[PDB]
Amino acid sequence: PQITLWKRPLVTIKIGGQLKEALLDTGADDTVLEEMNLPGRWKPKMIGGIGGFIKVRQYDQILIEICGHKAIGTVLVGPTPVNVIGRNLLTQIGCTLNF
């Protein structure tokens, strides 16, 4: 589909058997999701943006569906105010910027 940017580009995602809302974020290198108790191992990480850094847990090879488009890759979990789908997954669903 084509998504205009009059409002936040929010879409439903499926991760770890849960449905959530997340932003298609071209400015996000990685995918950062609200706190959730995913199973499996992880590695600590810190990511920076406006305001500073937050601590997150890096899970690798996570299955995630975005508008029926399946992907698999790294997902960061931490106290983020918003769920953001980053370029690591946007590339896997064929998402582009067009103007």
Added chain:
Amino acid sequence: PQITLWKRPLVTIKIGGQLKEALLDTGADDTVLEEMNLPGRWKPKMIGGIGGFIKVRQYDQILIEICGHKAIGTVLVGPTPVNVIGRNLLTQIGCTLNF
């Protein structure tokens, strides 16, 4: 143009007569540029990101050309980690997401 997301969507912008690199950031409501000198009046404002809130100077009705496309709107100036072009200007240049 059509921009894939295998790399950061960085483009050249012209603002205040000066060229700069900036990130096309669909996850940002507003446009935030690193510290610089801009003419005209400004108002102190607060903006929050993933890591908290920063202090910015709000410039209204600023001319800014993004990848050859002209826009006129609000530009926030402050200690952002990178120059980001937010939806307030992405809509003006006709930018949409497509997958």
